[PDB]
């Protein structure tokens, strides 16, 4: 797998600019937080509700162990 042996492609053009013709940070916090808020609204409905099921077992699991030693 070397570079001129990977695939076969036709009719595609690429334009690129030098690293010395570009400023370092084009859009940092005017575009940064509406892009992160898009990726947070997507994958927090798959990640977070499994971890609140651990929480309700933890808070119930140390409210039975502390009534297991008293009256």
């Amino acid at each position: 797998r070397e570079f001129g042996h990977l695939t076969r492609m036709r009719h595609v053009i690429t334009y690129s600019l030098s690293p010395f013709e570009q400023r370092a940070f084009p859009h940092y916090f005017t575009k940064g937080i509406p892009n992160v808020l898009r990726r947070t609204r997507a994958c927090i409905l798959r990640v977070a509700p499994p971890f609140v099921v651990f929480y309700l077992v933890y808070t119930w699991g140390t409210q039975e162990f502390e009534k297991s030693k008293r009256k």
């Binding site: 492609m9 036709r10 595609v12 053009i13 690429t14 334009y15 690129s16 600019l17 030098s18 013709e21």
Partner: protein, 49 residues
């Protein structure tokens, strides 16, 4: 260039190239809008050539 007289070429220029106006229309003379260089790249990929 070649076998030519400069004198003869001048009168031929005088009788034929005289109706050309010498100044411009409204005299809004042109100015050079210069051109700058830019490091960059363009790639056209075509494996059938």
């Amino acid at each position: 260039a070649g076998g030519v007289e400069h004198r003869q070429l001048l009168d031929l220029a005088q009788k034929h190239f005289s109706s050309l106006s010498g100044t411009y229309v409204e005299d809004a003379v042109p100015a050079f809008t210069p051109c700058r260089f830019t490091g960059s790249e363009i790639r056209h990929r075509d494996d059938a050539l």
